[PDB]
Amino acid sequence: GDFVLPELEDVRAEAATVDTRAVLALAEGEEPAESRAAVALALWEDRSIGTAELQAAAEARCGARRPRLHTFVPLYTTNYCDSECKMCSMRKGNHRLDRKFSGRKEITEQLEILYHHEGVRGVGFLTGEYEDKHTRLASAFRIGWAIRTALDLGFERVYFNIGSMEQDEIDVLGEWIGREDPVTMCVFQESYDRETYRRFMGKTSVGVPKADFDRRVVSFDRWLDAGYRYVNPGVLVGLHDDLSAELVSLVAHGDHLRSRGATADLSVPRMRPAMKSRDTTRVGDDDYLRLMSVVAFTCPEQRLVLTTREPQEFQDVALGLAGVISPGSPDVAPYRAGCEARNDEKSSQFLVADLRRPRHILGRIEASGTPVDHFVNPAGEASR
Amino acid sequence: GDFVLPELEDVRAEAATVDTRAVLALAEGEEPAESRAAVALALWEDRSIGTAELQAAAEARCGARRPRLHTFVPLYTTNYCDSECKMCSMRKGNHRLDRKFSGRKEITEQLEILYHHEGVRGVGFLTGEYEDKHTRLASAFRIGWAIRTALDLGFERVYFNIGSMEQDEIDVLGEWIGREDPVTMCVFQESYDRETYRRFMGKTSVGVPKADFDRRVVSFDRWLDAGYRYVNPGVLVGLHDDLSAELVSLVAHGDHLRSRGATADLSVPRMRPAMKSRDTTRVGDDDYLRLMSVVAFTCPEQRLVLTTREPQEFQDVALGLAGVISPGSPDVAPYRAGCEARNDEKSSQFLVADLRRPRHILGRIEASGTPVDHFVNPAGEASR
Ligand SMILES: Nc1ncnc2c1ncn2[C@@H]1O[C@H](CSCC[C@H](N)C(=O)O)[C@@H](O)[C@H]1O
Ligand SMILES: Nc1ncnc2c1ncn2[C@@H]1O[C@H](CSCC[C@H](N)C(=O)O)[C@@H](O)[C@H]1O
Ligand SMILES: O=C(O)c1cc2ccccc2[nH]1
Ligand SMILES: O=C(O)c1cc2ccccc2[nH]1
Ligand code: SF4
Ligand code: SF4
Ligand SMILES: [Br-]
Ligand SMILES: [Br-]
Ligand SMILES: [Br-]
Ligand SMILES: [Br-]
Ligand SMILES: [Br-]
Numbered sequence: 001g002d003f004v005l006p007e008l009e010d011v012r013a014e015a016a017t018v019d020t021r022a023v024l025a026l027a028e029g030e031e032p033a034e035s036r037a038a039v040a041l042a043l044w045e046d047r048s049i050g051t052a053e054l055q056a057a058a059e060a061r062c063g064a065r066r067p068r069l070h071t072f073v074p075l076y077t078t079n080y081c082d083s084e085c086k087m088c089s090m091r092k093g094n095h096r097l098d099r100k101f102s103g104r105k106e107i108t109e110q111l112e113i114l115y116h117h118e119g120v121r122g123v124g125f126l127t128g129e130y131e132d133k134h135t136r137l138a139s140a141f142r143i144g145w146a147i148r149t150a151l152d153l154g155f156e157r158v159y160f161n162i163g164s165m166e167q168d169e170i171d172v173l174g175e176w177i178g179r180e181d182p183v184t185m186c187v188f189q190e191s192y193d194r195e196t197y198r199r200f201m202g203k204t205s206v207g208v209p210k211a212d213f214d215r216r217v218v219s220f221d222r223w224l225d226a227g228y229r230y231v232n233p234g235v236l237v238g239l240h241d242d243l244s245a246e247l248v249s250l251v252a253h254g255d256h257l258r259s260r261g262a263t264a265d266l267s268v269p270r271m272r273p274a275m276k277s278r279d280t281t282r283v284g285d286d287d288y289l290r291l292m293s294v295v296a297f298t299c300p301e302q303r304l305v306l307t308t309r310e311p312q313e314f315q316d317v318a319l320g321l322a323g324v325i326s327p328g329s330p331d332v333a334p335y336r337a338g339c340e341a342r343n344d345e346k347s348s349q350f351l352v353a354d355l356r357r358p359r360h361i362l363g364r365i366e367a368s369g370t371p372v373d374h375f376v377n378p379a380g381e382a383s384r
Numbered sequence: 385g386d387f388v389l390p391e392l393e394d395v396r397a398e399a400a401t402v403d404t405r406a407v408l409a410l411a412e413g414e415e416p417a418e419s420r421a422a423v424a425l426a427l428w429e430d431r432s433i434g435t436a437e438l439q440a441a442a443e444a445r446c447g448a449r450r451p452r453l454h455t456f457v458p459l460y461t462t463n464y465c466d467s468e469c470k471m472c473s474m475r476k477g478n479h480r481l482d483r484k485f486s487g488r489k490e491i492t493e494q495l496e497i498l499y500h501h502e503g504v505r506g507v508g509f510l511t512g513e514y515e516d517k518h519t520r521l522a523s524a525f526r527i528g529w530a531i532r533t534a535l536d537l538g539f540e541r542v543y544f545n546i547g548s549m550e551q552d553e554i555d556v557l558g559e560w561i562g563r564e565d566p567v568t569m570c571v572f573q574e575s576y577d578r579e580t581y582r583r584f585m586g587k588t589s590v591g592v593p594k595a596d597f598d599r600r601v602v603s604f605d606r607w608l609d610a611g612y613r614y615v616n617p618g619v620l621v622g623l624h625d626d627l628s629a630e631l632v633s634l635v636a637h638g639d640h641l642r643s644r645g646a647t648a649d650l651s652v653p654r655m656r657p658a659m660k661s662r663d664t665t666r667v668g669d670d671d672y673l674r675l676m677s678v679v680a681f682t683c684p685e686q687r688l689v690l691t692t693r694e695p696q697e698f699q700d701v702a703l704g705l706a707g708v709i710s711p712g713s714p715d716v717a718p719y720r721a722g723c724e725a726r727n728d729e730k731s732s733q734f735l736v737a738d739l740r741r742p743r744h745i746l747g748r749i750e751a752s753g754t755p756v757d758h759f760v761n762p763a764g765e766a767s768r
């Protein structure tokens with residue numbers, strides 16, 4: 001019943017039977033005969049199909065989707081963490097980080113800033129991942145309170161990204177919400193390759209909670225077992241060298257979640273500067289756009305999430321492939337009325353490329369002709 | 385400005401100058417010329433004054449105090465702990481304990497049971513003490529929420545006992561309450577003798593948070609620095625062999641807190657059976673009654689707390705020395721409507737001696753002629 005990693009050699013054999021040109025000729029309602037992971041790999045490796053042409057086909061295949069875009073702003077509630085992800089500044093071994101923690105007052109104030117001054121109705125809560133069971137349960141309790149508080153304030157969509165979750169931890173968080181509340185669980189596998197995953201997330205049975213590959217990857221299945229609906233798998237582009245392997249696994253994961261009746265967003269965040277302890281791979285824009293295009297095309301009902309990790313010039317090019325736009329800063333309680341968000345190197349998880357305030361980014365998108373759901377521009381008679 | 389442990393040899397010299405008979409002849413308003421710790425030691429060691437006579441004088445000296453008694457019921461919100469107190473079953477090294485954690489639903493349900501079925505308006509929240517800063521802050525957040533939730537439900541008095549607290553941890557808890565809310569910080573020093581304290585609470589700089597004697601003992605001073613009022617020091621009778629040393633220090637601590645304008649309760653809980661890793665001292669009833677009498681007499685405005693650690697027959701004898709009566713069970717979420725509270729050895733901190741439900745214990749006290757404030761007997765037109 002739980003998700004099982006596909007064997008790449010099997011998907012390769014099926015990809016060899018896919019007619020990629022006939023796939024591109026499909027109407028926006030119809031589905032290929034082969035599996036989505038196999039179709040995705042075939043489109044990726046057929047270089048007679050240009051990346052630009054692949055992106056155009058993906059945007060058209062997702063063009064009927066309504067709403068075209070909705071938004072959420074990240075709110076890091078703390079930068080404490082018990083794990084040791086080597087590409088992340090919040091790793092416990094990073095003794096240079098200034099550790100911060102948002103209480104009841106600060107979380108509420110940040111939510112009111114985002115709601116009233118940035119005009120957003122979507123928010124995402126983030127934490128580290130913690131080792132001992134009591135800390136994990138206490139973390140689930142606080143984030144559950146934050147989700148309930150956001151929903152009561154009028155937030156229409158709430159993401160959370162707080163590490164892997166077991167059944168009893170989901171129970172604690174779940175007591176704050178209802179099974180039909182608009183709440184999305186985010187658990188990015190980062191890499192679906194166990195060797196690259198272990199290289200960056202560390203070795204198991206050593207008090208490093210994220211090193212357990214299997215507890216992490218089945219978190220969505222525990223979430224769905226409890227009766228919830230919205231999920232968000234992800235791949236950290238730049239860890240594993242073989243991008244074709246990650247797109248097969250991510251599409252396979254999305255396809256498994258869809259078969260369970262889940263609504264899934266798909267995230268492929270690209271690496272950003274951080275206080276790392278291991279080098280990462282720089283993925284060019286053409287590979288990255290081709291990756292997004294192949295995922296968006298094969299999974300047309302699963303929105304890609306695009307964030308301000310990417311610079312403004314890249315957002316202009318890739319926004320048509322996305323179904324979710326997420327501007328903000330990965331710093332603890334960084335927002336302030338009328339000021340751009342803080343992204344202090346001393347306390348942030350990484351350095352974003354676009355620090356413009358969300359209401360400007362989202363307002364420029366709307367001014368360009370794409371409405372953004374869960375964004376209420378605080379202009380005119382809506383100002384206050 | 386912080387509390388300083390008195391040197392026992394100095395208090396001994398002053399105690400030698402105290403006229404114990406003239407002390408007993410003092411009117412209930414007047415105060416001895418010597419220090420309270422010195423008067424307490426003198427009364428303790430003057431065996432020409434019987435314990436029964438000492439208890440009679442203490443009850444009369446506290447007889448004018450109004451209300452004569454108020455009550456609170458303990459609610460252990462979890463039995464996880466990072467420390468290693470050798471007389472406590474919740475010590476981390478006790479791998480036989482079944483660890484439990486109360487979420488939003490369970491805490492609320494327990495509060496409603498105590499309010500509506502037991503008729504109490506006082507509650508105390510308890511946890512373990514935790515090592516890493518994030519866990520301590522997350523614990524302060526949850527307990528702060530529980531305090532606010534209890535007050536909003538109509539609880540007129542809330543204790544908390546969650547270990548030592550630093551300034552930033554008090555800030556997190558404090559964001560849930562106001563500076564004039566009826567909230568009492570409980571931090572029992574257990575033993576004021578550093579050698580006995582280290583023997584039972586462990587050695588410092590080893591990840592055992594309660595081993596830091598000094599952080600614990602100045603917690604009340606941080607609480608008062610933040611502008612709060614109600615505090616509750618305590619001695620665990622049965623750790624240190626020399627009871628005269630502990631009464632000097634506890635009375636000295638209460639006197640320091642009084643000089644800072646604080647309202648203080650004084651707790652001298654007696655040892656109870658537990659999954660210990662070190663033997664404790666059995667203190668007889670006569671020594672214990674003499675201890676309570678000397679503390680109650682010298683600190684007449686600071687209520688002694690009497691709990692269901694003590695059997696019914698002892699409560700009958702010592703209740704006149706107390707200003708607070710606290711019935712309940714040291715098990716996680718143990719209360720159930722119409723049933724006696726659970727005290728399961730597999731999950732409790734220790735085994736209480738009186739498991740009768742609080743509304744029976746408190747109702748029998750009231751039937752005997754002592755009203756109990758913050759107790760609303762659910763009988764008659766107040767039933768349902
Ligand atoms: N240096 C970096 N640059 C860009 N994205 C990063 C990054 N470091 C981590 N991320 C991404 O940010 C995401 C959420 S922040 C991590 C949340 C949680 N502690 C967890 O580990 O699950 C991670 O899943 C990761 O994919
Ligand atoms: N075995 C036992 N019998 C009777 N009382 C005990 C006991 N073990 C601990 N206690 C008392 O119960 C009190 C509150 S329970 C401890 C709360 C918190 N974890 C802390 O250590 O501060 C302790 O201060 C201790 O004095
Ligand atoms: O990536 C996410 O899902 C989430 C975290 C985050 C960080 C930076 C910008 C947007 C963000 N949203
Ligand atoms: O001792 C306390 O202050 C508090 C904990 C506790 C345990 C058992 C009975 C009453 C209690 N109250
Ligand atoms: S990615 Fe998440 S779990 Fe890993 S070090 Fe960063 S905050 Fe911790
Ligand atoms: S007395 Fe408190 S800190 Fe010590 S082991 Fe027990 S619960 Fe933990
Ligand atoms: Br639209
Ligand atoms: Br980078
Ligand atoms: Br909206
Ligand atoms: Br009275
Ligand atoms: Br005992």
Ligand SMILES: [Br-]
Nearest residue numbers: 505757758759
């Ligand atoms: Br009352």
Ligand code: NA
Nearest residue numbers: 372373375376
């Ligand atoms: Na809009």
Ligand code: NA
Nearest residue numbers: 756757759760
């Ligand atoms: Na009463």
